[PDB]
Structure formats: C-alpha cells, structure tokens
Amino acid sequence: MKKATCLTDDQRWQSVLARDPNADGEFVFAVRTTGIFCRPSCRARHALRENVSFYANASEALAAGFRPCKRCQPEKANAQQHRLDKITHACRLLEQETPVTLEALADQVAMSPFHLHRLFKATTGMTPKAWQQAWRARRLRESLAK
Ligand SMILES: [Zn+2]
C-alpha cells in the first residue's frame, strides 16, 4: 500500500545503484542541478550522493517543482527482456516429439532464426535435433553398442 521509499538512504541508494528495471514503486530521484525527478528505477548517472533528492512517487517530486525523466521504466513497458529467460521458455515450449516449425518459434519471439539458433547455442549448446538424437544414441550406446 502506497509505494514509499526505503527505510534509509543506504537501503534506497541500493535499488538506484542496482538499476533494477523492476523497481516500479521504488523511489524517484530528484535532481536539484537539472531540476528533474527520475521514475522509481532509472540508472542515469545524475546527482551525486548529496545533490540528489528522494521521492516515493513521481507525483510527489513533481508537485515539489521538478521535471519528470522517462526512459527509466515508469510503468508497463518491458515484458521480460532476457536472452537466457527467453531460450529457457522455448526449451520448455518445444517439449514435443513431432517436428515443429522453426520460424514458428521465431513468431512468438518476433525474431529471425539467427537469433534463436544463436541464443539456443549460447545457452543450450546443442540444437533441438541433437536433443532427440541424444536420447536415441544414449539408449543404443547404453547397450554396449558401438
Ligand atoms: Zn530517468
């Protein structure tokens, strides 16, 4: 209830230095120099540890007489933003046995086969075709085959 600042200056400065894009409700940084207040999150190098103000909500700092600074995720913007989290979702989504369309997976991610194939290779390391063949090869080799 009521998105307020942290319990101390050090505790709040943490979220600021952390640059957590999911700080929707953290605290807006008021700049006395430029006279602007950044959304709860934000990570733009502005105002040192003395020339910066702390506001619970953008409405609070704005009323005081400051200009709002966007581009720091104010509310509703990034759906996920993550290469590892994306491929992880694909790996689970592609838990079928029948050959699935490549571009189809590209449709959900809204990217080309170069990104998915590259990302999947950067994390997984092996293509989806290798996974299926891996099980078959393991079942055959497990019987002292080859
Ligand atoms: Zn900002």
Swiss-Prot record:
It comes from Escherichia coli (strain K12). The active site is at 38 (nucleophile). Involved in the adaptive response to alkylation damage in DNA caused by alkylating agents. Repairs O6-methylguanine (O6-MeG) and O4-methylthymine (O4-MeT) in DNA. Also specifically repairs the Sp diastereomer of DNA methylphosphotriester lesions by the same mechanism, although the methyl transfer occurs onto a different cysteine residue (Cys-38). Cannot demethylate the other diastereomer, Rp-methylphosphotriester. The methylation of Ada by methylphosphotriesters in DNA leads to its activation as a transcriptional regulator that activates the transcription of its own gene, ada, and other alkylation resistance genes, alkA, alkB and aidB. It comes from the Bacteria. Zn(2+) binds at residues 38, 42, 69, 72. In the C-terminal section; belongs to the MGMT family. Disulfide bonds: none annotated. Residues 85-146 form the HTH araC/xylS-type domain. DNA binds at residues 34, 43, 45, 67. This is Bifunctional transcriptional activator/DNA repair enzyme Ada. This enzyme catalyzes only one turnover and therefore is not strictly catalytic. According to one definition, an enzyme is a biocatalyst that acts repeatedly and over many reaction cycles. The record marks 128-129 as: Cleavage. The chain holds residues 1 to 146 of 354 of the full protein. Residues 1-146 are annotated as: Methylphosphotriester-DNA--protein-cysteine methyltransferase.
